[PDB]
Amino acid sequence: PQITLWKRPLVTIKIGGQLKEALLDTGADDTVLEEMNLPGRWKPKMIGGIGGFIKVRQYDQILIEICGHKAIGTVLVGPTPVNVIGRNLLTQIGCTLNF
Amino acid sequence: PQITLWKRPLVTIKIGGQLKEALLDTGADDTVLEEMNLPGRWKPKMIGGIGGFIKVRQYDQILIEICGHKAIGTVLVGPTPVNVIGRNLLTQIGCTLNF
Ligand SMILES: CC[C@H](C)CN(C[C@@H](O)[C@H](Cc1ccccc1)NC(=O)O[C@H]1CO[C@H]2OCC[C@H]21)S(=O)(=O)c1ccc(OC)cc1
């Protein structure tokens, strides 16, 4: 599909057996999701943006379905105000910017 | 152009007659540039990101050319980690997401 940017580009995603809303975010290197109690091992990470850094948990090889398109890769979990789908998964669903 | 997302979508912009590099950021409502001198009046404002809130100077109705496309809109100037072009200007240049 084609998504205009008059409003936030929120889409439904499926991860860890849950449905959530997340931003298709070309400005995010990585995917960062609201706190959720995923199983398995993880490693600590800090990521920075406007306002400074937050501590997150990095999970690898996570299955995630974005608007019907399947992907698998690294997801960071922590106290983010918003779920963001980053470039690491946007590439996997064939997402481009166009103007 | 069509921009893939294996790398950061960095483009050259022109603002205040000066060239800069900036990130096309669909997860940003607003455009936030690193500290710089701009002509005209401004007003102090706050904006929040993943790590908290920062103080910025708001410049309204600023001419800015993004990868050869012209926009006129609000630009926030302050201690952002990188220059980001947000939806307020991405809409003006006709930018959409496509997958
Ligand atoms: C360094 C570039 C950029 C600031 C990075 N951000 C992605 C943005 O899309 C961020 C994503 C974001 C969106 C909403 C709330 C928190 C973060 N948007 C944002 O901060 O936008 C601000 C400017 O306009 C306003 O509209 C939203 C907040 C304001 S981020 O969330 O902090 C981020 C995401 C993934 C990362 O992996 C390394 C590292 C940082």
Please judge whether B97 and A97 are an interchain contact, meaning their C-beta atoms are less than 8 angstroms apart: yes
d(CA B65, CA B56): 21
Cβ atoms of residues A76 and A33 within 8 Å: yes
B17 — contact with chain A (CB < 8 Å)? no
Render chain A in DSSP notation, one character per residue: -EE-SSS--EEEEEETTEEEEEEE-TT-SSEEE------S--EEEEEEETTEEEEEEEEEEEEEEETTEEEEEEEEESS-SS-EE-HHHHGGGT-EEE-
d(CA A11, CA A97): 16
What values do phi and psi take at A82, rounded to 5? -145, 150
d(CA B27, CA B83): 13
Resolution value, angstrom units? 2.0
For residue A35, what are the domain limits?
A: 1-99
User: Number of structural domains, chain A?
Assistant: 1
Please judge whether A98 and B4 are an interchain contact, meaning their C-beta atoms are less than 8 angstroms apart: no
* Nearest residue to B39 via CA among B9, B61, B19, B8: B61
Experimental method: X-ray
* Ligand 1 touching residue B49 (CB < 6 A): yes
- Could you identify the atom of ligand 1 that is nearest to the CA of residue A86? 35
- Output the CA torsion sign for A45, A48, A54, A59: negative
